[PDB]
């Protein structure tokens, strides 16, 4: 669709909610509108020149929704139908968690930034799996959901003993319904602050996850069409989400581990705790998203692309609002882009607008297709 009065109507309403209403209340209200399917669709064809892929995972367009937006997979269809090629649901944990004390999400309109200390609030693996299953069933009968990718972000409980025990439990429950799994070792907001990113630990963590996935394939007697009730009809790829608050050595050490473990991709990056010059946020705890994160994460993409010798596919996040923002991420080495803050500040038109902007920009820079632009800034 577009341009629409439908889009425009909701973007007035959203700007109103932004001025007057609590962020988390607004988010939940819009998730609820999405669940009842009264939000706009982008029914347009995506440019065959902005297709992209990660290994054998194929994206109709280079834009997805980041993790934390739909933690419980209650709104997947409606978010996808806004014009995104994929969504990363979660982060989920083996059991439900309330998360930290409310209010825990604050916005700063002028810097177009967000700070949050949610602390992995989610309904837990079992309920979210049931939600994802219902989505997969709907997807079989919904033409606008065909070839759309759902990844699942997985983490640990707040009091949990061993992180790995948690990841394995999630994999066994939800893995069959996922096109990829994102390992969340990077959230500030669960104590660590980082769920362990230390290279030896990570290596163990990556290996354990691949194995669980492998195990699902071995244990089951059904053919793949049947086992993988997902989009790809294959086993989920394994990504890891990294925090930008690391030093060059830590980054070098992580880069080696990713190569050693043969990880399918890295999501660069999560929220930062290194931002200070946001006045409204000075009394606040958590990680910062949005425009202030942009250059930090772009620089981080560049480094990890270099350190991994261009061998590991990158998913970019965040501070991405414009087609230019997207191209910067792509030329630094990202194959695909995730949006979060952009939806908060720019509303229903985020995917429609950013796709148009990037298409026009890819054209006016001589690139024949998107894949030509990946890593070209180096
Ligand atoms: C309120 C909120 C909740 C989030 N929850 C998660 C989460 O559950 N898991 C995760 O990996 N990232 C989470 N994130 C981080 C985002 O996925 C994203 O990486 C970050 O916002 C940077 O993108 P952006 O600048 O476009 O917002 C959350 C971010 C915010 C704003
Ligand atoms: C005003 C505001 C909004 C918001 N969240 C949004 C914004 C856009 C959304 C679009 C959707 C589109 C389809 C389905 C669900 C959707 C859910 C949405 C949720 N937040 N979050 C933290 N502060 C916020 N302030
Ligand atoms: O749940 C959260 O608090 C959270 C998780 C995460 O990975 N990143 C973030 O900024 N917040």
Task: Tell me what you see in this structure.
It is an enzyme of class 1 (oxidoreductase). Monomer. One of its GO terms (biological process) is 'de novo' UMP biosynthetic process. It is found in: Mitochondrion inner membrane. The protein is built from 12 helices and 13 strands. The protein is of the alpha/beta class and 378 residues long. It has an 8-stranded parallel beta barrel with strand order 3-4-7-8-9-10-12-13, surrounded by 5 helices. A 3-stranded antiparallel β-sheet has the order 5-6-11, with no helix packed on it. Strands 1-2 form a two-stranded antiparallel sheet. Bound molecules: flavin mononucleotide, the ligand Cc1cc(Nc2ccc3cc4ccccc4cc3c2)n2ncnc2n1 and orotic acid.
Secondary-structure topology with pairs:
Blueprint lengths: L4 H16 L2 H13 L16 E3 L2 E3 L3 E3 L10 H5 L5 E7 L12 E4 L4 E4 L8 H17 L7 E6 L8 H12 L5 E5 L14 H21 L4 H4 L9 E6 L5 H14 L3 E4 L18 E4 L3 H14 L6 E3 L6 H9 L2 E6 L1 H6 L3 H14 L15
Parallel strand pairs: 3-4, 3-13, 4-7, 7-8, 8-9, 9-10, 10-12, 12-13
Antiparallel strand pairs: 1-2, 5-6, 6-11
Helix pairs in contact: 4-5, 5-6, 6-8, 10-12
Bound molecules: flavin mononucleotide (FMN), ligand J4Z and orotic acid.
Catalytic activity: (S)-dihydroorotate + a quinone = orotate + a quinol
Protein name: Dihydroorotate dehydrogenase (quinone), mitochondrial
Pathway: Pyrimidine metabolism; UMP biosynthesis via de novo pathway; orotate from (S)-dihydroorotate (quinone route): step 1/1
């Amino acid at each position: 669709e577009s341009y629409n009065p439908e889009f425009f109507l909701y973007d007035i309403f959203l700007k109103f909610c932004l001025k007057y209403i609590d962020g988390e209340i607004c988010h939940d209200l819009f998730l609820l509108l999405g669940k009842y399917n009264i939000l706009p669709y982008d029914t347009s064809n995506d440019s065959i020149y902005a297709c992209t892929n990660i290994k054998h995972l194929d994206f109709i367009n280079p834009f997805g929704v980041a993790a934390g937006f739909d933690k419980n997979g209650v709104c997947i269809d409606s978010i996808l139908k806004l014009g995104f090629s994929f969504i990363e649901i979660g982060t989920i944990t083996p059991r439900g968690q309330t998360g930290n004390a409310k209010p825990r999400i604050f916005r700063d309109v002028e810097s177009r930034s967000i700070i949050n200390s949610c602390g992995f609030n989610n309904m837990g693996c079992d309920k979210v799996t049931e939600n994802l299953i219902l989505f997969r069933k709907r997807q079989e009968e919904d033409k606008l959901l065909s070839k759309h990718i759902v990844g699942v972000s997985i983490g640990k409980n707040k009091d949990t003993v061993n992180i790995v025990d948690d990841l394995k439990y999630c994999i066994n429950k939800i893995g069959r319904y996922a096109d990829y799994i994102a390992i969340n070792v990077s959230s500030p907001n669960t104590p660590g602050l980082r769920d362990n990113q230390e290279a030896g630990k990570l290596k163990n963590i990556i290996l354990s996850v691949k194995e669980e996935i492998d195990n699902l394939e071995k244990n089951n007697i059904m053919n793949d069409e049947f086992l993988w009730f997902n989009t790809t009809k294959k086993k989920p790829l394994v990504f890891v989400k990294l925090a930008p608050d690391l030093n060059q050595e830590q980054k070098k050490e992580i880069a080696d581990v990713l190569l050693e473990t043969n990880i399918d991709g890295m999501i660069i990056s999560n929220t930062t705790t290194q931002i200070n010059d946001i006045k409204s946020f000075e009394n606040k705890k958590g990680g910062v998203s949005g425009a202030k994160l942009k250059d930090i994460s772009t620089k981080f993409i560049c480094e990890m692309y270099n350190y991994t010798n261009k061998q590991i596919p990158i998913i970019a996040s965040g501070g991405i609002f414009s087609g230019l923002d997207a191209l910067e991420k792509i030329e630094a080495g990202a194959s695909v882009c995730q949006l979060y803050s952009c939806l908060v500040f720019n509303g229903m038109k985020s995917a429609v607008q950013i796709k148009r902007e990037l298409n026009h920009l890819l054209y006016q820079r001589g690139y024949y297709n998107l894949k030509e632009a990946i890593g070209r800034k180096h």
